[PDB]
Structure formats: structure tokens, C-alpha cells
Amino acid sequence: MDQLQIKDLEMFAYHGLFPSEKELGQKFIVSAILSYDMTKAATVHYGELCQQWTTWFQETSEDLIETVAYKLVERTFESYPLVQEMKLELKKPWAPVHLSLDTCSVTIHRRKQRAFIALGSNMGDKQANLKQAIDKLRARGIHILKESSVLASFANQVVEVETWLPAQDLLETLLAIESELGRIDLDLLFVEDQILYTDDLILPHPYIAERLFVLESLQEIAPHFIHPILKQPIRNLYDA
Amino acid sequence: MDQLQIKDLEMFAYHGLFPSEKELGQKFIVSAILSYDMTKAATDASVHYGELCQQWTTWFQETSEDLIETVAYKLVERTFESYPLVQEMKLELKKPWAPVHLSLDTCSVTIHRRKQRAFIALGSNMGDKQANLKQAIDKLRARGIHILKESSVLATDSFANQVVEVETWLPAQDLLETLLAIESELGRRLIDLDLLFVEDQILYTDDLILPHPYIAERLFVLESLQEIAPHFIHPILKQPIRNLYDA
Amino acid sequence: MDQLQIKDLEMFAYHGLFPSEKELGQKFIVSAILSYDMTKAATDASVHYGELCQQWTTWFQETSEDLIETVAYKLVERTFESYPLVQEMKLELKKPWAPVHLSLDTCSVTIHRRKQRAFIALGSNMGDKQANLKQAIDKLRARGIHILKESSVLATDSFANQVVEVETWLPAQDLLETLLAIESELGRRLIDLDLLFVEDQILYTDDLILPHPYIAERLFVLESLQEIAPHFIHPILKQPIRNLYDA
Amino acid sequence: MDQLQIKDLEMFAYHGLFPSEKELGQKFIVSAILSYDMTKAATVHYGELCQQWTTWFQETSEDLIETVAYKLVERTFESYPLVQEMKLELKKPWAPVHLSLDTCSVTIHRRKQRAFIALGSNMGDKQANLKQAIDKLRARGIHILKESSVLASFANQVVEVETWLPAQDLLETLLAIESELGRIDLDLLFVEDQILYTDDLILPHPYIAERLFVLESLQEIAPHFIHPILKQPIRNLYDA
Amino acid sequence: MDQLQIKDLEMFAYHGLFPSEKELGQKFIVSAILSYDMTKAATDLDLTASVHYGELCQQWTTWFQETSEDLIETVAYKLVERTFESYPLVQEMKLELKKPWAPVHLSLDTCSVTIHRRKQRAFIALGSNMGDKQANLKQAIDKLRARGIHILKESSVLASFANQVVEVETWLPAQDLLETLLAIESELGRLIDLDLLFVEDQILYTDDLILPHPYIAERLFVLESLQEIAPHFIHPILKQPIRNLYDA
Amino acid sequence: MDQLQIKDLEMFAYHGLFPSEKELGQKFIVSAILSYDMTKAATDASVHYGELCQQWTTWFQETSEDLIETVAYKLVERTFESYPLVQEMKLELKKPWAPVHLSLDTCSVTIHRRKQRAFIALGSNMGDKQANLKQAIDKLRARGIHILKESSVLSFANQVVEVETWLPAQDLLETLLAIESELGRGPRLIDLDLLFVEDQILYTDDLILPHPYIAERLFVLESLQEIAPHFIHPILKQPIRNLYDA
Amino acid sequence: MDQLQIKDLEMFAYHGLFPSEKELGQKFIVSAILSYDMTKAATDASVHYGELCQQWTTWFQETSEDLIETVAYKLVERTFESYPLVQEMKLELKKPWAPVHLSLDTCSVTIHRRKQRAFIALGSNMGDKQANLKQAIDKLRARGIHILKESSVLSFANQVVEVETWLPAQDLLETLLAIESELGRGPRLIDLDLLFVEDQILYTDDLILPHPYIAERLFVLESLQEIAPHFIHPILKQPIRNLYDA
Amino acid sequence: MDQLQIKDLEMFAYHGLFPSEKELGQKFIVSAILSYDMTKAATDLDLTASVHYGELCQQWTTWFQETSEDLIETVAYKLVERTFESYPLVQEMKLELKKPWAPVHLSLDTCSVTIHRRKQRAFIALGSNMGDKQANLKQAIDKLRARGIHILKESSVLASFANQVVEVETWLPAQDLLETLLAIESELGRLIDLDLLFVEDQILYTDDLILPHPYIAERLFVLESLQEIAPHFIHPILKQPIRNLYDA
Predict the structure, then answer these.
(1) Which fold has domain E1-119?
(2) What keywords would UniProt list here (chains A, D)?
(3) Of A108, A128, E151, E169, whose CB has the highest number of CB atoms within 10 Å?
(4) Is G7 labeled as catalytic in the residue annotation?
(5) How, if at all, do strands G116-124 and G191-197 pair?
């Protein structure tokens, strides 16, 4: 994949914990690599991108440079749909450490990914809860690529989406949605190829090959997708 | 794998979108990494710097493009053409006088391509079937993609079927796009081209699924696949064509 | 995953093999990359530079070591101890006044460690079986490796058997070596420790095979494995413990 | 894995095609990353390594900087068995290009790898040819780790070895050995985990799971090794 | 003497001859050495006796972007002229203006213009014998002031010519001072009569200008009014006080 | 003359005008050129870096000054005090993190001082004239300026003194006037005149060198030929000895 | 005086002592400081970089010299010829790839020249004396040195000339002697003397400035007061005009 | 004047006071500016009139490693002294010796010592009246030569004292010249009598040395022999030729 980079754009701002830092401000250096296929253009603007970055960077005084570096990434993805993966290093060479060094930097790195989430409900307006969820999901900026039809004391459905949130972060934002509708049932099923085993998340979801109703609605929107572990197209798993 | 690199070669030219730019020109800096096994050259066959730099600096100045991407890609595209030894290339084109009006170091575009072996299936069932296939494999050649090995074309209103093994540096999505472009420019059934495998790779995108999802189910595709590549391993089923064919 | 880095922090100290070095000391330069997900800190939890640098510069000067490796490793080892947030660390220690007598830039040693989840099996059939196991899991804790989850110990002259799930940054070969060192220092049957899995990893070296080659065949190991990690996937058999257990 | 690096050691020598270059000599800059586990030392010498490199580099005038960069790598592995993987960049900033640039470099990169090779013979002193082969192999600097016993109108055997030669280069050196004994039959079976499909080499060797005599002698020295494709221990493949 | 310096201030602007340059603009870099005696500021903690960078940099950067000049010399000269006007502490300048994106089409590090000026004490003889002799004189010292050269001390007038000599402070080098003298003469009907006498210590012998003016020690009415305002000033060639020269 | 130089020594401290700067501190870079004749050290005596850099760094961090000048001056002043070998010094203090909010390499202040030999005439005709004179040479010595040579003392009491100072002329002068003040200033008490400061020759509003009347005041030539009969008047291009025979 | 400077312009060429160097060529870096008064350009006249750099680079590559000096000198010489605005020039030629086999940043040669005003006395008392004189001023003009002012011509025939040259004194002299040669050198033909070159004042084995006898040769003061009666003798500290009334 | 310069030659050696430094050695960097008139070499393609770098660098680097000195000044002074001996083209030096691994234990860029010397014309008066007056004189000019100072011109001797003045070339600054004068006096039983008269143009007034020597214009036998070897040399203070001063 091709990349566009901006190396070491200088920025003055007022970020830092100390209220003296917020008062004097200091120099910050930004560097980013944006990845996407250039083959079509060969066969984004710099001035603009730098201008926006430089606007976004000074709208406020954050306490943490992490928080600013992340805002830039998030807003870059919102404004340049072309971009697939971004890596932004934010450097703070005047940090008040009192030692000699070249610099301290925080670098945040995010990649658009395709995922499938299962929704279920069985109390209240069973289907109202399903729609509210795809909505809350859309509101968080995650894109809804493709949704299945919904199946009839429970209602189910699955959704294909696109997000730059790492798996664990997606999961957290899924649980936050469960909360803010009073605890529905959202499950991350796959996020691409990926396969994890952490305390809070197993990918792919450990029961997919044994839940007919999940394979059902999964096979409707993604009959050819391969299960990264069983090495089989959904279409086929559904056949047993 | 081993690498030759040219770091920060300086070049003046006149690319840019603004007409003021095409008028004054500006400094550009080029860097590249070319990869290929040097074991043979080192032990007895290799690229020359003076020439490589000299050529790049010619191709770079031939014209003014609007976008530096387009110039970076051209240099990559032709380097591959002129130095078949090279397997993988990564070329960064830096534009440090870009008219941003802020302090930075530089703003660059870097294009990265690698040769890959791929298998594409051809089918025709109207007209001079067998010539439609030939003209497709020609368009392929003409777009710089290399025909490594080609099966024989069998009759399967019958289909002429064949599969071709090729070497190309176009990324998967791009190979596909050029495949469709070729279907178009021979009347869109006239020919069918399918991307079956590009090496080991496995993609699931809106436009391309690799490997192609019906390979293990299409005797006529395993037919021709098995003739030229019986030991190639299906990256999903984790079996040799040869074996998949025996059902 | 996101990263904090400290680039080129300068430090004077007295490490070196030569006694002339311990006497004059020299300049050293430290650089590191610490990795961990910053999404939570950025959105509501994070490391501080001033402190991190200040600590490193204390631990660096506590003593004179012979070898810079040993100082680099100490900084890594303690950074993990003091900042559990950190998942992966890569620390470069540059020694640009090294007494080589040739012109260069610098000569550095860089040590790189990542936390990993691993499963280790314990067995005992002599003495206070159940205490031998406890003391092993203690030695483990005492060497800084973390006990994440531990199965129950079952009787299988019977064996006490158990398996433990742990988090450690020691590379596979090193985990093993410390496993054997623990067998030694409790009388070498007193206890058996086996490395079963370290994540996804699969090695075949003279001293260690991962995953351990008999896991799918030892009901008593799947027993305890299935109790704490039934969904973990065997990286070879490409199945969940749970399933391997059902035979 | 940990690394030791030397950045930009300067060297004057007489390498180049032009006989003017051989005459005046010029400056060369060397940089290397040597990888091996440091955990044992923490719980190689620089002065020496630089001195040797700098000796080896000036013993001769090669035409190609590639050839010198490779000599250094090869000799480094011979002299420091500890080293597992090496990456040496040789830079030629005075190259006679007549343009402005920072430098042109060649960088050669090699890693020790475990491989298994099958030997067969069936004409002449069947077993004499087998022994001559393991010898020729040892003479090329490849290490013999472990050899099986030899099986009885053919004689077979398999060998486990260690080499930093990339797969294709191993293969070439195998065919060179076949030649210099008058055309035996050496086959690369595995080189570690690796799996290739090139015109001259398929790894693993496409017939292993179907050759009882190969599995035989393979199961003797490596019953637990996993077939990177069939995902099975040799021991088990041999059982059918 | 002490020096305050600003190294490599970055500034984007639109200066140059080509109209494509005035359209895209380009990066310029500034570096200056301001000189003056910092001993009072260091010692009395005297904020008024030092220059504030932040503001220096901020002004320079404003004056720098007010307009698009054709030549960078013109812009560099402007900052020098303005600094002297706004920061009377400063005694001597040297300001370098770098143009690294200059459309040369070769590799280099940079091109740069660097203008260097120093405040100087000078003496100027004024005569008139035509129209309102009297008036001409005043209007000349005024024209002088108008140009920003400073009048330090003026002698009484000797009233068939009328005569005066003035002591002034200027940063313009001697040749330019002379030119702006002649400029005034002209913008006055060619009446007045201006002569550079000394500019400090200096002694030149060029086509347009001889310093000290070669007739001083023989012109009684010049000593007359020179001894009035600088009796102790020493003739750089004859090596004596005006005072004594006048006594002959 | 030879030079010893320390290039870009880094130092953290808390100097600055902004209270946020005292609070946070920033990086400062120091570079100095000390001049002195090294021929003597090189041939058998010299400065250490270990020490010079250690002290500078101590001195630089003892306090927090509002102006970096006052600090850069502190180091020049102190250095001359503790290293009498040094004859001329140039010390540049750089403030790369100055809160200007523009891109630049840096801002710096560089203070440059040189030891010089001067002659000061003292006069008194009021109170205890003799005392007056003595207290002036003392005040002077107190300010750190060195007394090299003093003439005998010559109604009015006169004297002239040979001294060594690194203060530039104008500043030497100011300090002369300040002494006159702190001693109370028709009849006077004291009169300090700068007579010469080396070779130099001025013409400014506040001071003229050499002082315009020397060649014409016998009392001055008197006590001045006594301690420096061979010194050459930078303008009349003659020895004092000689100007005195007239 | 203001300065225009071109910093580290890169140029490839084939200069050098080693035949392997002519054959292969190497990189050269050039930096120049041209001085001239910019006040006039800045206020309404100046040099281009486009051009200055293009020409320098042409000139630098026309030939292959054994010494980099001869090349660095070529650029100074030519520049003064094509840009009469320039008054002083300093041009440094760096040879980073010089075949020294040691680590260093670079070796360089930097040639520095300044326009100066001089006075040359001409005499002839043999052959066609008048002609002799005229051919000398011509030879001179040929060498590029400019004739600013010539006195009228005064057995022996005498003359004195005001000229402008960038040659340092000693080299001006050498060229004077060379002319004397190429015109044939009791009775002579020509006599060139360096009388003054500005303000300057020498004392070397080959040349003394000002020439030690001026104040004592009427014929010289004669033709010299005629074209420069106000010029000041750098030593006697008087106008020629005046020295002539004696 | 033109200049040849060698920038940042790297050299490893074993110089310093600590014995751990003499044991490990460390990196030193050298940079010099050699000055002389390159006009002959540029013009006549005159190889003998330029300095060869390769060799310069090679020698310096040999002399640099011959020994371990305690102080870097000593080593820097050595290269200066030796260069002048081996490359008579060179008129003026400045050689900087950098010690970046100096065991200071703070961040800096470097420490450095930089020694700067210039060939000069000087005049020295010799007198004796004791033992073999005659002999003393010769042995002194010889001692002079021995130190490497060069005898350019010596006057005839004026034979109750015997007297001579010599013209020489030295790079030692005036104070050091005086010291080595006194050194000779001593290594001769304190007989001889050496006086620095002028060293060029220069005029000093320090504790140990007044230049020009303050009695020249009144000492007939000094003018006597000075007018013999440099009649046109000009007294930097009285501004007249020795020749004329002697005529009184």
C-alpha cells in the first residue's frame, strides 16, 4: 500500500498538565503517514491537510498529548474517506523533563477494518432494540456496510461494518451501547482475519459455528467470508 | 532478500497542480529501495547506480505532471520494465518546497510494489472462442503483466476454458481492475477473466475475494490449474491442486 | 498498538569491561519505545516522561556494570515492573565513546521484550505433592512472571497435576530455562514443569518444542487446560481446548 | 530477539569496476545489525568486530561492493557462532554518479535456519556417495546437526542442518554438489516453517507425505517436527 | 560590545521578480545580530535596557509580510531601517535574509543577502547666499531630520553667505549619506550647500567623496562653528582638537 | 592569542520574565571563548574543563534571574575573578525554548569583555582631602577593578592611578561617577577622571578618550610620568615623560 | 558593506593532480561572499543568483585543472570582470572527496580579493621614451588592471597613473616587473614603481609601501598632485598638494 | 590573503592528565586554517607553491600520535611549530584541537584549544662588554637560530661595549619572543644583552615589554646599525624612516 507523509510540521499550542504549560504554550512537532492505494490517482492536498491539522491542534488545550494526537487521527478519517490506515507521531521536544534528550513523542496508529457484529433482543419491543443499536453504532462513527434481515422468543440479526477501532476498543464501545440501552445483546463475531484471546475478548467469537441463527444471517450478507479458524466459507458452515 | 538503495537523489523539475509551479519548477528528492537476491552477483547479475540515477533523473524530467504520485509511479513502473532482476521496489518522492505555508520538514508520497505470481482463468463461448482467449492473454502482456506458463485451452453451446500463470506487480485490487478493463475493451459472453489466486494471499473486499470462492468446485478450472501447477497449494484448503483435482 | 518514545536521552555513567572505563566513565545515550493501547487515556491510564526519564537515569547510575547489555536489560525489566500498563518495550543503549579506535557513529545494544500469555503444566508425585506445586507457582511469581489464572489441582503412586496460565515477557527459550532452573532449585520426581503454549507461537528448537508435542494426547493436561481456557485455540490442531478434550 | 549494532564505521578501500577506482580508492561506510538473544549475557566485542571487519574489508579489491558486503557477512557467521541473523549495509557515498544524492548502499541480509535434506543413491558404491555428499555439504560451511541411519536397489538417508543460505541458494548449492559428483540425488525437504512455490523450488518438497522411506529416516531424527502444510508431526504422517 | 541575536527565524512571504513567485510565495529565513552594551540591563535588572525577542520577532515578521517586494535586499533593508527606528538601544545591525527556494535549478544550501549598518556621528557644513539665506538653512536641517537622520547639536548661524555646521547621528554609510545630501540640495533648487565634513574617525578617498573634507583646517568659518559644538573632536588626519586648529 | 572554548554546554534552569517560566524552567545552551596566551602551558599554567564547566553550571543554577543577560554577565564576571589567567572572554547564552511562538533556531545573548589597562586621576580639595583620595582608591578596589600602580599624592590634593579593568570605557566611567556619589557630590571631595584606557580613543556624549586636557595639566603629567613615563599618548603620539618636559 | 552570498553550491567536475581523478571526477562544493553597497538597489542595480550560479557552474566545468586553486581563482577573476558592481569577493572551493585517506569533514581553498586604488609612476629615458610609457599603460590595461586617471607626461620622461586593481600589492608588483620584462629590461626603457595602494602600508623584502622616496621626488609629486592633489600620504599624514609645496 | 583549510580531521590518540585517559585514548578532532598567497599557484600552475593535503594530513596525524602528552595545548602547539618548520609557504596558522570525549560529565558539544601564530619581522639589539665581547655576540645570534627563529639580515658590529642589531623572522608573539630572549641571556651567564626593538608595526605597553623599545630615537649606535640594515623601515610611533631618525 502507498503512503502519503508529512514529516515534522511544527505547531505551537497550549497542551500539558501543569497550569504553567497551559499558560505559556510550547512547540510541538507533528508527523504522519497516511496509507491508501495511489494507483488510481497516479494513472489528498498537502496545504489543506496541514492547515486543518494545524487548526484542529489549536482549538483547545488538552491535558494529554495522547488526547490531541487521537483527535487528529479521528478527524482525519472523518474528513478523508480515502485514507485506510494512519500513523501520527506527536512530538513534545520542550517537555519539562530536566535532562538532555532529543524528544519525547506519542504515536497513535489506527487501520480501517471490516467486522461483523451479532445483535439479539428478547424483552421490550424486540425489534425496536435492534434498530436502536444499529443507530447508536452509526452515531459512534462506525460505518454500516451491510445488514441482514432480522429473524423471529428472541429477534436476531447481523451486521457488517467498518471501523478503525482496534478490536478491544470496538468491544468496549459495544458494551457501552448495551449500557446506554439498560444492559439487547451485541457480540463481536469477527474483525477481519484477526484472531485474539484476551481476557475480555475472544475472536472469532467462540460459538459461531454452532449457532444456526447466526450463520443464517451471516450467510445472507457474507456467504463467501472465510472463518479464520475453521478455514471455511460461512456458506459451508451453515450447511451443517 | 537483499537491497540496493539510492538515498535522497536530488532532481529539479516542474510538476505540480498550480500553473505557477509548472512555470518555476522546484526541488524534488527521490529515494528508493530495490530488492532482489544478490547472492549470485556477489559470489560469481546486478543494477548500476550511475545509470539508474541517470535514467530516473531522465524519466523524471520528460514531462510535467500534476501529481507527484503519477511521477513516482512512472519511475517504479519503468524501473521494473528495465531491470527484470528487481523483485520489489519502494520509491519515495519528496516535495520539500510544496507551497504549504507552514514549517515542516517535507511532504512525500511513497509508492511500493512487489512482483507476485498469480493465476487468472479465461472463458469464452461466443465468436472465435479460441482467439478471444489469445487476445485477452495479449492485452495482459501489453499491460506489462508477464505470462509465465499457460494451460491448454479445452472445450467444455460449449466454453473455451484456459488458465494462465502470470507475474505481476499490480496489487490484487488493481490486477482485478485491469482484468475488467480488458473484458470491456473486447465487448464485456465474449470473454471472462477471473483472478483465482495471487500467491498465498487471501482477501475479502467489496470487489475481490481471493482465492476465488469456487475453485475447488469447478472441475474445469482444476483441470487446467492442475496441468500447469499441480503442486501449488490452495491457501485455504491447504491442499495441492493435484489433490483437489482428484475429486 | 500505540507507542510512547523517549529518543536519545543522555546519561553519564561508569559501565564497561576495562578498569580505565569504570574509572573515567563515559557518555551513554538511551532510546526507547513503549507500547500499549492509548485509546482509553486519550478519550477519558498513561506513563509520565519526566518521571520515566528520571527513573531510568537513576537505575542506570546505581552501579557499574561490565556489559551494557546487563544495564539495558535492567532498565527493561524494571520498567515493566513499575508500569504494568506497558505491553512491549524496546530499549536501545548507545555507547558512542566505546574505546574502538576507528571512526563510526556509535555501537549500541538493543533489547526488545513483549508480554505474552503462556500455559505451564505442573506435576508432582513425591513428598507433599500439593505444596510442591504451590512452591513452584511461587518461584514463578518471585521471578516476576504473573499468575493470571490457575486450574485446580487434581490427583491422577498418584500425580498431583495442575496447569497455570501466566503472563510473561521472557522469550520462549528463556521461560523454559527459568522453568528448569526452578525444577533445580527444588531438587530436580519432586516437580515437573512443562511449557505448553506461549500464545500462538510455534517453535522447533533443540531445547524447546511449542506447543508441547503431547498436549492433545494427555487427558490430564486437557483436563486442567479446559477448565481455565476452554476456548483457547491449539495453534496446530486449530481447535479449542474444549473440543480436543471431548476425545 | 536482541540486537547489537554498529552504525556507520568508516573504511577506506579500493573496490569498484573502473580501474581508476581501484587506483585511488575511496570512502566506504559500513553499518550492521547482528541479532541473537542477550538475556544470558545480560544476566561479542566491539573493538574486535570493527577491527576484523575493517581487516576483511581491505584484504582485497573487489569489483562489486555486493561481493565485499557478502564476505563480511559470511565471515562474521564463521567467527561468531552466537550470531543468528545479520544485516550489513555497505554504503558508497563517493560513487561516481554525477548527481547530488546522499548515498548509494547495498545491504545484504541473512538468517540461520534449520533445514532437512534427503539423500539418495543407486549406482556405484551406493553408500560411498551418501557419505561424500554429507561431506561436500560440510565443506560448503553448512552445519550437520543430526543425521539418520541409512536405509537399504537404492540407499536413503536424511539430514538436519543449519545454514544461513536462503532457500533458493541452498538449492543451488545442492545442485552444485550433484554436479561435482557426476549428477546421488539431494532434495530440500523443509527449511523450517517456510513454504515457497518458485520455478526452481517447492517447499516443503511436494512428496514427503507419500514417501515411506523419507518419513522413516525423518521420524528418527525429528519425530516431533511439524509439517508446515499438513499441520502434523512427522511421527504421525509416518504412521500411515 | 554585546550582541543579541536571532538565528533562522522562519517566515513565509511573497517576495521576488517572477510573477509566479508573487503568486506562490516561498519560505525565507532571517538571522540578525543586534549590538549594544548589555552591561546596564545585566546589572540593574533594567528591562528597558534590553530588547524583547518575542516582540522583535513578531514585528519583523509583520513588516516582512506587509507587501511583496521584487528584491529581497529591499525587504532586508526595511527591517534594518525599522528596527533602528523602533529600538533606539540598538547601535549596530547585521541582518541576513536567506532565500532557500530561490529558483536556481542547482543544489546548494542557500542564497542570502545580508545588510549591515552602524550608527555614526557625522558633521555637515551648511551654507547659503541666495533668497532667504536664513530660511534655506532651517529647511535643510528639516529635510535632514525628515529622512530620519538625527540632529544632535547645531551651531549658531554665521550671517554674501550664511553658514552653519550640524552634528548628527546616522546609520547610512558615508557614500549614501553624501547621496542623500545631494538629494536634498536638489529638492531645493540646487541656495543651499551641504558638505560632509567628517563621519567619525573615518577617512575615505573615493571618486565622489573625500573624508575628512579636505579644506577644513583652512576654512576659518567652518572651524568657527565647528569649535562651537565640538571643540574637542579630533581631526582624524591632523590629529588635533578642532579647538586648536581654530586657534590658527 | 590562544583560545580555550567550551561549545554548547547544556544547562537547565529557571530564568525568564514570565512567571510560568520560573515555575517550569527550560533548557539553556552556553558557549564561551576564553583567550589567553597558551605558549607557556604548552612548553613546560592552564584551565580545566571538568572544573570550568562544573562551576559555570553551579553559578548558572544558584538563582533564577528575570534577564538572561544578568546571568551571562555573572559567568563572565565570576570567571575573571576565579581564573586570573584569562584576558578576554566571550560567553554566549542561548535560549532555544524562549516563548516566542515562531519557528527559529534560537535567540541568544552574548556578552564580550576584555581586560584593559587604564589611568584615573583623583583630586580632592574639601574635608580630609588625603582621606577622600584613599577612600576612592579603596571603593575602586572593592568594585573588583585592580590597582596596579599608584602615584604619590601631590588648595587641592592630586593623584593618578594605573588600574586593570574588564569594564568597557563607558561603564568604567559610570562606575567612577557612582563612587563620586557614594562619597557625596567650587570645592568637591573627589574628582575621578578617566585619563586613558589603553590605546583606545573615543568621542561620545558622555566620555572622551583620551581625556582632552591631559597634555595641558602639569599636575596630571606630574604624577603620571611618575608611574608611567613611557606610556604613549594615543593621539599626540608621544611618551608622557616627554609631554611632561613642557 | 552588504553582502550577497551563495552557500555550498554543488558542482561536479574533473579537477585534480591524480590522473585517476581527471578520469573519474568528484564532487566540489562552492561558497562565495560578494560585497557591495546594496543601499541603492534596496531603495529604487544588483546581482542574479539564477545567473551567477549558472555561470559559475559553466566556468567551473569548462576545463580540468590540476590545482583547485587555479579554478577558484578563475571564478574570482571572471566574476569581477562580468559584475563590475562587486567590490570584494571571497570564494571558497571545497573538495570533500579528496583522496586523503583519513576521516575529515573537508579540505578547501578559499581565495579572497578586494578592489583597490593605486598609483604607479612610469619613467623612460631610452628609445622612443614617449612610446615606452604609452605601451606600459597599455600592457597594464591588457592585464585587466583599470586605468582611472593618467597625469600628463613630464634625459628622462615621467608620468604617474591612478589605477584600480584587485591584485594584492605583492602581486601587482610582480605584474609590474613582468611588463618591464616583456618590454626589455644606466639608461632603461621603463620603470614601473608602486607608489601607493590605498591607505596600505608594507614592509617586505620585495616591496615597501608607500614607496620610500615619494616625498622627496619633485617629478613624482608633480604629476601626482596633478591627478590626485588631495590624496593623503598614509604615513606623513598629508595631502600630495602639500608635500608638493616643498 | 588566501587560506587552505582542513576541517575536522579525526585522530585517535592517548593524550590527557588522568592515567585512565593515557590507557584508553580517545577521539580528537583537528581543524586548521593555513594562510598564504595562492595567486602564484593558481596562475603558474605551480605545484611547489601549494601545500599537499594528503601529506599535510598524514604528517599531522603522525606527529599527533608520536607520544602521549598531558595537555592538548602542548600537542596543538607542536603541530603548529612543526608545520611552520616543514611548509615554509605558510605565513599564518590557526589550528584548533577538539576533545569531545573530555571527561566532563555534562552534555556539550565539545571542548577545544586553539592556537594561532603568524610569522613576523622583528629587530633585536645585541650588546656585550665582558669576556670576548665579539664571541658573545655570535653565540647569541646562534642560540637565536637554534630556537628556530630565522636571521634575515645582520648588521656589522660596532666595536667598553660591542653592538649589533639583527633583523629576524619569528612566529612567536612579542611577549614570548621576549621571554626566549631572556632565556638566552641566562643560558649565557646573564656579557650579552638582548633587546627587542620592534616587532613590525606593533606597539605594546605591558608589564614586561614596551614596543617599540622606548629609547631608539635617542640611541645613536642603535640607529647606526639599524639604518644599515633597514633604512626605510618606519618607526611605528614617530612615523619616520630609521634613515631619517639617524640623520639627527
Answers:
(1) GTP Cyclohydrolase I, domain 2 (3.30.1130)
(2) ATP-binding, Folate biosynthesis, Kinase, Lyase, Magnesium, Metal-binding, Multifunctional enzyme, Nucleotide-binding, Transferase
(3) A108
(4) no
(5) antiparallel
